[PDB]
Amino acid sequence: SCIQFTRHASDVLLNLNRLRSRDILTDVVIVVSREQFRAHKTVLMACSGLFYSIFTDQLKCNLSVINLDPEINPEGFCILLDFMYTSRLNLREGNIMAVMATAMYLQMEHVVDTCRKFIKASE
């Protein structure tokens, strides 16, 4: 018999992104080649099958630094990290291949789906 506040989940996510922008309570740095990205482990796990696996691991759960595979593109990661915190995906002709490869690695199935559909439409 609950009532539901429609905008609540979006409002929560907006405030989590504000915390990220101000570097408040971030507990991990994701290293992608020469670039570093600070984030909240809970948000990363909630969005990515890869981070969910990493941070449920009894040893990796306590690491402050995670190094991604050297084949991962920093811009592709940046676009996906922004997506995690906003629901908005900056998908462009110039970045779609990097975004899709990064989303496959991060196990972000909905992003992979759409990248596949956008590529299929251009061929």
Next chain:
Amino acid sequence: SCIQFTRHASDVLLNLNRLRSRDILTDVVIVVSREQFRAHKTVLMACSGLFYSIFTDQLKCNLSVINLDPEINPEGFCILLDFMYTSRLNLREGNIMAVMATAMYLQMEHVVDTCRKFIKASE
């Protein structure tokens, strides 16, 4: 020129609630009289003006235990904590006064609004 995934914010919140249920990466215990509630500081701040103030404080940000005012009802807090993590508010005739008082203390304006409207309709 971004695209947006409609269900993303709800999916994030669902996974944050799963983390809470499994006690994964919870970093604070909220003590309400004889009861204890584990939560994620980032979610509490994102939902409550009171917790946003508490956890941006340079000393309180590092506390693992927060004790609420003894006038706060544990069931009212429990209902609001569930709301924070799900967007669903278990508002009942028997708990509405406790929920509204707790929401005023926690500075959760949308919950206060609706409690006020539900009370006005019954008088």
Next chain:
Amino acid sequence: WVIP
């Protein structure tokens, strides 16, 4: 607020 809605009835979900």
Next chain:
Amino acid sequence: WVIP
């Protein structure tokens, strides 16, 4: 997915 939508155009926001």
